[PDB]
Structures are given as structure tokens and as C-alpha cells.
Amino acid sequence: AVLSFHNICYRVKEILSNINGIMKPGLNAILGPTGGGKSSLLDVLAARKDPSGLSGDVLINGAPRPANFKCNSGYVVQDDVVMGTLTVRENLQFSAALRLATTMTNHEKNERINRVIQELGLDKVADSKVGTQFIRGVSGGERKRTSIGMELITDPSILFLDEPTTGLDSSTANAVLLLLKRMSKQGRTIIFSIHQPRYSIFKLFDSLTLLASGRLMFHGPAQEALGYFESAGYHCEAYNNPADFFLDIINGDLIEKLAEIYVNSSFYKETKAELHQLSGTTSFCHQLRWVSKRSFKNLLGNPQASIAQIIVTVVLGLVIGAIYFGLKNDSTGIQNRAGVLFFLTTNQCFSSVSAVELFVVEKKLFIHEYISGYYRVSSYFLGKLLSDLLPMRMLPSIIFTCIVYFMLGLKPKADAFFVMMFTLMMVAYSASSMALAIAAGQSVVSVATLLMTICFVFMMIFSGLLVNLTTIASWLSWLQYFSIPRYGFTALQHNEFLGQNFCPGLNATGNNPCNYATCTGEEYLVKQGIDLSPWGLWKNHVALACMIVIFLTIAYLKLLFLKKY
Amino acid sequence: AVLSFHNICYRVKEILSNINGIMKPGLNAILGPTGGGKSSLLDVLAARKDPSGLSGDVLINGAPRPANFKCNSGYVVQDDVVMGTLTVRENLQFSAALRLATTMTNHEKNERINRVIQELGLDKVADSKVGTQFIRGVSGGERKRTSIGMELITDPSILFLDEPTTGLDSSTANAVLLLLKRMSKQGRTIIFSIHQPRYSIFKLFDSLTLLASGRLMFHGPAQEALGYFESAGYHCEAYNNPADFFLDIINGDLIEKLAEIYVNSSFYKETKAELHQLSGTTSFCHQLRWVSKRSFKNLLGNPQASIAQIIVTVVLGLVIGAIYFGLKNDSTGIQNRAGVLFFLTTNQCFSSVSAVELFVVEKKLFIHEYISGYYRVSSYFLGKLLSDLLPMRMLPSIIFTCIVYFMLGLKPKADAFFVMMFTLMMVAYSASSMALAIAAGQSVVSVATLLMTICFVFMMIFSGLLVNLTTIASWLSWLQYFSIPRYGFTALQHNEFLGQNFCPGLNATGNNPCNYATCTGEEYLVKQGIDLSPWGLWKNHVALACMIVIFLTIAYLKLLFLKKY
């Protein structure tokens, strides 16, 4: 596996100049200051970057680079994206099930997993929970070892890291670079950038590249990496770090005069002499079923924002049941009976912000797993919102309805239960999908100010219970069609107020000089301005379903049109 | 200025062992691994740490350390706490006005400021806005120079840094350590820790301490810092970093056998021979007036969460005015007239979360400025909540009331305006102080879930407008006394529904077999269950004032009982 590249003048203003070199099958490194091309040449050498502004020729083993390159390579990204709620073995089982083909068997796949575990030396922590400095089960070094082990299951013939030392102890950094030299002895070429190395980890490198501010300063083996600058008139001082001295040369202790010495060097010509000789998946159900399993296990790992929602739903169910237990077929009736229906509708207004972060907390993981070819965007999307839907959208409406009707008995049908439970599910899931679509990239004040403004306007003002909607002039009355709880309130009124008279032998209908001698619900739905046909019960459900589809399409398009490079 | 210390066995489990040394007036450094006492001995040498578990003797110039030590020293903390919305000169003017005494003059103080500016070399950025990688006006190095310059106005005879290199470019790090050696030539002793130094910045150090895992490994000058380990049998390898080699010795390439070589060394005895010879504000109005000025200028620097609140308040004022413009003295009256009063009361429900972060975003700055003796806790508290109160609590109620009554005319008094404006101010400031007290240390889901649960329960359920409160049994009706908008709703009903009959020549009072032949507000307040005396208007204001005082006392005690060490 010989990765090669030639004159890659990457421009987005010209962040890389003309650059060429050959990545021999060893422990190739890329050094330099942070603002240079140390992290950009690595993304150019992987895909990891907009291929439009390349203007170069990256080439593997003589042939140019395929589009099927991120599926056969491996990019261990810098910030550890590994799941800090799963164990090591069920991180690697996940990556095995989504990177290895389904044609092979679970027996062979688990042999591959424990082969990688015994290779990387993870066996004493092969069932502890990985941590992210959130819940402590592993070290930092074994966490980095898991991030390396995930991109080894596919057996990559060419492996990319991205600063595999930063944020670590020097003992763990020396141990992980010794791990890379151990795993590099199978011919597996390893290419990485490093921030501020030391002379301990410098004999490890088979070849060495060095970029500064977009220019190439050196590309050759480390045994004459010092000899180049010792040929250019500089002197390595006594007991001085050479890798740090490479930076002390290029910080001014100009760079246009320092770059050209490599242009007229000997390794420029020897590199170009070989370089011109070189130049002349998985089924959808499987990805859905594994993403949903991973998110279920993550939700069991962090059940703190979910049992909080279950606790508040039980407390709200008990409170609204106790308030509604004091409502009978009496004179103190319909005006508070229409208040408890609004409470039943908007009982899940608090839980809408719990799904504001569903594709935001793991987006550095989503971008990496998508462009490494694990799953599709639609598959990740459906597998994630099939994992928030069951225990955080459908379950609290189940337990809220079974707590409300435990403190009750109003229409014994066992179908008013089902249509109420479906209405609460539709209202809760519609408001939660609105919080997915409308609020994604915002702060801690802005998300809650936004979701309380569209709790003011579209739940208290326009979902008309305390201003009658057929008095507003017809340029502000149209905003009642955008409000979630008006549909749920209408669908619960149409289920509550059908047939019952609420006045046991006290009609008094016909008191014309008086006011409001009307008590039945059939002459209350027309006063509220809502339908009486059975289409008037399901018009609200089809409107909420249209809102769910539109908000989930906005939440899907915000995932599809994400800069994944 | 000779800082000295002897046998400081700090324990919180015994994170420091017995430790002694002498900080000569130079450029003393403290090295080692991160988990050792590199950052803990520095906090022990400053105050910066619980003085209970010290068990040692820190001593300056022969005399023991005064309690007036943080006011005369200077601690440049690691994470830059400098304000990223003010300029350099008005950071230093702030620190001058709160650290230099009020007995001297502004003329001399500004001479001190531009003396420090011309000394540290900040003059070409002496009026640019400091940034925090938020709004870019300075570099990182000039930002660190501002953090150094703030703790130089008091003219400290002994200056503490805390890793003044990490997160910087190596050019800026070498320039800032050359700045420390430049400013150290006036006898100003400088004591710092460093994470991973290089041999470029090693000749600078006058003396050098080195801790590892709580034990002292070396304390002496840097010219024999290598000679100690070259006397202990180790060999410094060719072209190898000595400062990194100090870590390569102590990472195992045990430590109980490596520590005792310094115990039987020559510098142990020579240090102990001198060590045993050694051992044998500002007015409250000024601090309030400068903290409030700093927070006003910070609010002008980031007017993005405030003009958002002003924009939403104008839009809500226009919407509620347009809905209320369709309400007359007609039959479609009191039931929606009691809905628009609830909208007027809870129009600032969205802005309550905008003050959830007021002492949370700057708490690393507050802890440092308190224990460096800038201000009192009560002074910072009052100066900060006098700066959120005017443009984010009082101003939107002003413009909401002047937008609502611009689209109106209901009781021309110019006193209903004032009592409505005061009621909206009290409700808004009470809900915002509740969001200060109840939610401080929480996440992005938890803050909004909490402030929407106590928007469900204490604003829609129990602030009774859509369930009549005098039907609930008297074990859940008591929760109406904890709700903010019930008081504002009662205080606006008592101002709206006094005297007016709402029925122009259509009384019909006395229709006993019929239902609800009552139209006047005086027989509507008794139906709502609220008072008619003028005490019934101000009982709600004194209850809201009690809530403001209790929630602000909780927000003050959470600032007082904060671990400031």
C-alpha cells in the first residue's frame, strides 16, 4: 500500500501550495505548526475534504484513488467519537456489524473482534463501559485504543490517524505510538499528524513529512530529517529536541526562502523520479436495526433525562387527575371540563425540548460514521427517531392516559381510551418533531426562548380556549392552523362532548331574553366552532400527521445538507 | 521578595507530600506531570486553596504569610477570564479602579495604565476589543498579555502565573516568556507552572522546582537541574530535550526510590540550612458602580440576546393589541377580556430563561475576582442584577405597555397605565428571579424542561383562569400561592374590572331559573374569588415582592456558598 500525491494545490485562500511525496508502507508522519497544512494535508490524503478544490493527483499503488476509499481506509479522528455509554466489545460489535459484510457470519465476526481485542491489548477492559470523562470506566489511552480498534475491523490496508497523542499523558502517548509500530509490522501503512512531538517518539517514524503555512518543508525518512537541516547551514544545539527544533527553524527563531531549499534538494528529485514513474454495502433494515439497538443501549446508559420525564409525567398525571376528579355532571361543569382537556392535550409541552439535541449531541460521530460508509442518512435518521419515539414519546402518553383514567371513569368504552391515547401521542410527537426541526443549532438561552415563544403564541394565544378564535379578524385568525394543541384540543373535545347532556332533567332551553341557557355538548361544539361529523375527529389527526411529516422532513434535510467535510 | 515554604503536606488523599524550597526573586518555575503537584503547589503557594488541610509553613521574606496576601500578590489564572467584550484599556481601567485605592486620582491611575500598556507592548491593540475566540479583535498572545496586565496594576511584589503557555502558538509562548524575563528584571519575582516546556524556554528560569505525584523531585537552579540527574546515574542522550527528559525519567521510561535521591542530595541540606535560618479596601458604592458599568458595556458588546427579547416583545405587543383591539363593551366580553389580561400578565414568560446564566457564564471570573479582592459578594450581586434589571426586565415591560395602550384606550386615567406597568415589571422580574434561584447548575435540556414544567404547573394549571380555583380540594388549592402569574392576573383584574358595567342599558339582573345574568365587574371579582378593597390590588404586589426577596436571597446564598478555592 503506497499512497502517493503530486502538486496538490488545495484552495478554499490557497491554504496548501504545491505538495508531493510518497507514503511508504511504514509509520509515516506529518509534522508542523497547527495553522499549516498539518491537519489539511491529512484530510486531503483521506477523503475528509471537499474534492472540488483539490487540483492534484492522489494515487494508491500506481492507480488513482477510488471513490470506494473511505470504506477501505480508516480515519481515527482526533476528538474521540466513540460511544461513552457502551462497552468496548459492543462498540466493536457495532462497527463490525456495519462495516463487515452481512455475507459472513457472527461466529467469524466475533473472532475478528476478539482478535482485534487481543491485538490492541484491551482484554482487561474489554467489557468495561467506555467513558468520555462523563462516566468513568476506562482510561483515556484505552479510549483512544477503542477508537483505533473501531477502524480496524474492516481490515484497512492503509490507516489514517489525526493527532493520536493530544490530550493524553506522555506515558499513554508513548504506549499508543508503540502500539502503532507494533501493528505497523504487518505492512499496514499508518499516516498521521502530530502536535508537538518529542525525541522519544521520533525513532518510530518510517518516513516523515513536514508542512508549514501551506508550503512543504521536508518529506523524507527521519534518519536524514535532521541531516537535511544540518546540510542547510543550521546547527542542532547540544541536548536540544530535534522535533521542536524543526519548529524553532520555521518560527523565525523568510518562509519563502526556507521552502525553496527543499525544492532544490536531493529528495525532491529522487521523489519526483519515482513519482513520474508512478504517474506514467449493507441492507437498509440491517443499518436501521443496528442504529436503533445502539441508541437503545445508549438510552439505558444515560437514563437521567428519561426517568425525569417519566417522573414529571406521573406527577402531572396525578395532579390533573386529582383536579379532574372533582368534575361531575354538575353545574360547575363545561368551562372547567374544557380546561382539563387542554391540560390533557398540552401535558407534554415540557418534554418537547428533550428532543432538541437528538442529532446535535452526536453530530461529530454522525459525520464521521456517514462519510466512513457505515449507514445512509435516511437510515441513521429513521433508526434514531425510532429510538426516541418508543421510550420518550409514546411511553409517557401511555402512562399519562393510564394514570388519568385510573383516577376517573367518564365514558366506559375502551375506545375513548384509544382515541385519547392516540391523540396525546400525535400531539406529543408533533411538538417534539417541531422542536427537532425549528431548533437545532442554537444556545441554551435561545433554544428555551424559542420554545417558550412558540409555547406562548401557538399554544396559549392561538390554540383557542381563552380567546374565542371566531372573533379575531381574518388576518390573525389564520395563525390557528399552525398551532399544535388546537388540533389535540379539538380532537379531545370531539371525543368528550358527544351525546352527553350534562344536565340531568334541567333543560331550560328557550330562555331568549336571558343568556346562555345551553348545556349539551352538541350545542357546545357549534359554539366552539368545530365539526360534529366523524371527519371532524380525524381532521385534526391528519393535520397533525401533516405537521409531523413536514417537520421531520425539515429535520431530515438539515441532516442531508450538512457540511460533512 | 523571597517566598519560602517548609514541609507542606497538603491533604484533601494526601495529594502533596512533604515539600520545601525557596522561591528566589527571579523567574522560578514549577514542572512535572499534570496529575502531580504542579498545579496544586502553585495554589498552595498562592492562597487559591483550602487553608485547613495545609499542614505547612509558607513564608515571605522571613515573616509568615499575611491574610492580606491575594490583594498584594497576583495570580494570572490559566483559562483567560478577561472580558471578551471590552477593550484592553477598559479592562485595565476596571482593574485599576477596583484594585488601586480611591485615595489616588484618575490622572495617576491612567498614567499607571498606559505605563503597563507601554511596558507589556499592547499599544497597537490598546483599544481593540479583546476576544475569547468569540469576537475577534486581538490575538491569543495579546489576550494573555491583557490577563498578565490586569494583575500588574496593583504593583505586586510577587507574581503567580498558572501555565502561561498552554493553548498558544510556540512563537507567542516564547514571546510571553521573554516578556516575563523582561518584567522580572525589576526584582518582581515570578512563579509559574508549565505544561510540557522545551529547551528553548529553559535558560530563562532563575530557579526550578519539579513535582511528581505529590513528591518533590528537584528544587534548585536550572544550571544544575541537569547536573543533579547527571549525578544520579542517568545520562542525557544526544540531541535530547532535557525538560522532556525530566518527564522521561519519572514515567518509568519506583518513584519512592527516585524521590529519596533528592532527600539525600546536596541542595536538600543547603536549602534546609537557609530555611531553618528563615524559620528561626474600596467603598461599596464604588464597587457597585464599576461592576454595573462593566456589565452595561458587556451588554452593549453582546446585544444579541437582548434585542431578540425586544423584538419578541414588540411582536407580542402588536399581536396581543390586535387581538385586544377587537374587544369592546359588548356581549362577546368578559370571558375573552379575562384572557387578554392573562396574556398581558404572562407576556414575559419567554424572557425568564434569559437570566438563567447571569452568574453562571462568568463564574470562573467571579471566583477569581472575589478571592483576588476586587469586590464583595453582595456588591458583585447587586451590581450585576442592577445591570440585568434595567435593559432586560424593566425596559420590555415599558415598551410592551406602550405598545398595548397605543392600540387601545379603555380607561383614560394615566394611573391604570402606571399600575399595569408596575404589575408587569413585578411579574417579569419575579419570574426571572425564580429562574435565577431555581435553575443555575443544569444542562440545556434540564433548564428548559424545568422552566417549562414550572410554566405548566404554576402558570397554566394553578394560576387559575381556565380551572376555577375555588373548586379544587384544599390540599391542592394551596399551590396557587406559589404561582407568579396568579398575582399579576389578580392585580390586573382589580385594575380593569372596577366600576364598569359592560352592559349599556341591558341589566337583566334577577333571572333566577336561568343561568349567569351578571355582567358587571364588581359581581365578577367575587365570582373569581378576589377582593374588592384597595388592599386587594396591592396584596398581589407585596406577595410578588416577597417572592422576589426570597428568590434573590437564594440566588445570593448560592453565590456566597460557592467553593471559591
Author numbering:
A (entry chain A), B (entry chain B): 35 to 46, 61 to 301, 328 to 354, 370 to 654
Mind quoting what the paper says about this structure?
ABCG2 transports uric acid and plays an essential role in the pathology of gout, but also confers resistance to a variety of chemotherapeutics including topoisomerase inhibitors (i.e., mitoxantrone (MXN), etoposide, topotecan, SN38), anthracyclines (i.e., doxorubicin and daunorubicin), antimetabolites (i.e., methotrexate and 5-fluorouracil), and photosensitizers (i.e., pheophorbide A). There are more than 200 known ABCG2 substrates which have highly diverse chemical structures and functions, and the substrate spectrum of ABCG2 is substantially overlapping with and yet distinct from that of Pgp or ABCC14. In this work, we used cryo-EM and biochemical assays to characterize the structures of ABCG2 in the unliganded state, and in the presence of the chemotherapeutic agents imatinib, MXN, or SN38. In total, our results delineate a new paradigm for the conformational transition cycle of ABCG2, and reveal how different chemotherapy compounds distinctively alter the conformational space of the transporter.
